[PDB]
Amino acid sequence: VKRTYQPNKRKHSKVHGFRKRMSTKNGRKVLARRRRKGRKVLSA
Amino acid sequence: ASTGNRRSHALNSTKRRWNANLQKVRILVDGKPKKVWVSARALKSGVTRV
Amino acid sequence: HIKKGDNVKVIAGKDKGKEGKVIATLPKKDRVVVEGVNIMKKHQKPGILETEAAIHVSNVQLLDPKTNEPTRVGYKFVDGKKVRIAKKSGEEI
Amino acid sequence: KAKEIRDLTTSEIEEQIKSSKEELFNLRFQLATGQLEETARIRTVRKTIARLKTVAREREIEQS
Amino acid sequence: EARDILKRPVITEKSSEAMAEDKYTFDVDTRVNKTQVKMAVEEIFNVKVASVNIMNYKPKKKRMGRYQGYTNKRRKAIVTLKEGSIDLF
């Protein structure tokens, strides 16, 4: 059966990547939250 | 624009705004004419219409 | 105050009352290695090798050059350079 | 080595920098072929380059 | 710059067969191009270069105990001489 996750390097980077997060105010809020929590990984 | 309440007869309150009576007017800013939005109260209380 | 080559007396441990030369020092462990003190009998795989193990520096004491008594260490400033003086007598080491 | 480096001229220090870099590169090649056996020379030459670049940098800042 | 471009020689069975065929294999700085590699080899070893092939190697998974990480990424250059040879001993 076809499952929900169909990985795609380009789609992953374009939707969840660092530059996409930077492009919006709320995305920069995401990055700030992860930096505050101390995450090793900030984005895709 | 300021913010306040619309109140019904039963005194129900809904948020609303009060907007200035802005009129687009040809004005001389910095010595060069331009069409800017200026309120009627300001126009009566002399920007400078050109 | 304890330095390699110094003659010291053991004041605590199995070798209490023994005397011997300070083989080595370990400042990070605050320990010293003294000749003929604290033999360990290690199993070596190339027999049984006898070697000294370190002891805590606070378990040995310098000996007085005059009265031979164990003495604590003070310091003076003879000719500028800091020098060691026995607290028992007052003479340099 | 800095005191001795400061006795050298400006053209000498550049020549020392070139010659030290060649020596270090020769050491790295010998290490990669298992021929070196004297691995403390590598750190010594690297720090000589650092000292040589420091003295050159001080002179230029001082003159400027 | 040339002695920075060239990092170390590579000694393997495949590299040794290449040396038998007059090809010399170097690990180079991961930022340099094959033209820089050719110039550096010519300058350092006073030889003539027929061609330079180049490739990249990804970081490799490596661990000791509980720590899993990666080795350094590599840039490998194979230099084909037309004139002369390079003595690695």
Next chain:
RNA sequence: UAUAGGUGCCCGUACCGCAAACCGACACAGGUAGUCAAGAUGAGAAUUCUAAGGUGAGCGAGCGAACUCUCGU
């Protein structure tokens, strides 16, 4: 309104890939775009047996009861 000599960079290149390496928590009877397309039979890329090539499937040995399932009369 030709010959002549010389130069030619970066990224990818391993391996799996209708799967034991991808998506399914699994060495999971599922899902996964395109290309190549042999012979006999035949309208055919259907059917059956084969070619090129690949595979014998990561528990077995007996027994040959009820019962269950899948088949034949």
Next chain:
RNA sequence: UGAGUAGCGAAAGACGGGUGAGAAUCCCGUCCACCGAUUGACUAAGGUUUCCAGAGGAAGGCUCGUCCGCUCUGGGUUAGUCGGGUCCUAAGCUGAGGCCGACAGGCGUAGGCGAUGGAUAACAGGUUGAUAUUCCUGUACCACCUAUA
């Protein structure tokens, strides 16, 4: 506890020889059988060293294991021409000025980014344990540079 119970995930194996502490289960051989519009061959996505050689057998493998996509060590990916960039645009995204909007911001002009499309010069053979239109051999083509013309 249930209990040495259910299950061990579609199917054809047999024997000889070898290795080994140990073999139904690994290697070699012979015969047999299964797919064959495919269980064959080649691209793409996706994965990311799983690839190769030697060594190993705790754990992983639904049994076993001398074996492995597992463990240890050391290796392996070669391009002017292949696919992409140094070319082009589509949807879409973005957008100097600009328009709009409590703020945050939304929209949009020129322009720009953007292949799933357009353009564009290399073939055959050989070779390794692991790469090959990339290495090698033979024979080409394209762009640019310099000299004779």
Next chain:
RNA sequence: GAGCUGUAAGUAAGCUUUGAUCCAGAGAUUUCCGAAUGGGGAAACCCAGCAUGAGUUAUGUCAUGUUAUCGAUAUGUGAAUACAUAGCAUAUCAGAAGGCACACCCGGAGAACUGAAACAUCUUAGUACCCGGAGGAAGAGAAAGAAAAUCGAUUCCCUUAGUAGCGGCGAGCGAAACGGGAAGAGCCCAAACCAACGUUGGGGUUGAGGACAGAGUUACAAAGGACGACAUUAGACGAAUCAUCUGGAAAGAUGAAUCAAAGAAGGUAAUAAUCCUGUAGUCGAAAAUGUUGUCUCUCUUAUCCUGAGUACGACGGAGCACGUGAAAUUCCGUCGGAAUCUGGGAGGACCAUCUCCUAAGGCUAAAUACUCUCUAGUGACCGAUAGUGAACAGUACCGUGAGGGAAAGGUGAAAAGCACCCCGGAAGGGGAGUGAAAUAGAACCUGAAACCGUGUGCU
């Protein structure tokens, strides 16, 4: 002041009394991404233009510098269009961008569950969240005030007081002045009018005044110096115990001593004021940051006016403890709209009298708020299911993503971490050794219960 090349063994090669490793101040270097800014981009990558310079016959390639956008400054080119303007080039500068503990603060905008035993006014609450702006604090602040005998900027603490009051007069909401305290500070403009070219300097700053007739870089104006002193950022000195016993080990027991401006606290083979690191006390800085002083240093010695689209009013809202109320007082939108010391505002509708004050300009330290931090310390706070989620982690793992989010400490005083022999491929054992102890052998202190076995006294 003798070791040292991180954690961290392990060798290898070395460094260090001609002073290393280490510690503190000051410098140098400081790849790439990131506001990211030459252009692009799926962060840590790709692709360029100019100038300068290696190199090459030449190209290819390479090195340095520079090239974003909006802004300032001043030189040109310059539309429709005469002049101009917009626009387009250049040159110089480097002003903004983004981040945070952004905790506390100011502003914009602003819920709902909830309570009212239902619910709509009301409450939750101007709370959560979001957005903008800053500082070490912010905000407020020098009376058109509080008041009714007078006080004299603001802020904060106590009290007034759960009072006065507000309120489907329900649920609830809820002051202030007086009094007592912390702290304490006051000033600059606009205008009358003068002298120079409406703009500049002088003039002036208030409850009646004005026109007219020694102080300071903490506001009140802003730049430096000279020197001193103190503090922080490394450090130094620093009193006094020996013996026996048990023990593997003494600090314990016993005996006999000693020091104390030092009997805080850790460590040391068990429990140490005198063994060590220290403590009381005392000393110390090449350099850099701070604080604070003296000298210097400068700055200085009712004729007229007094804040106008204002005050104020009507309508619609909001803030005031206060829900439109008898609602004063403050603010916003719309529209109207004064007076000019014989003036104007307030004293809870309003009028009169009286009393107090002088709006429509600005600045202003301190007492106050907070803690990711740093330094020094504290606890009838935790002690590994506790205490941080985290004593070894925002990791592993889960999720497309926002996001969620563990488990896991202890040999021994000292590795002395079991030479060697034997069975075994190994694993694992039995000896022998080390150790005070190995049922302390690393899956290592203690080793409960469930649970699983072996033997058997009675049955």
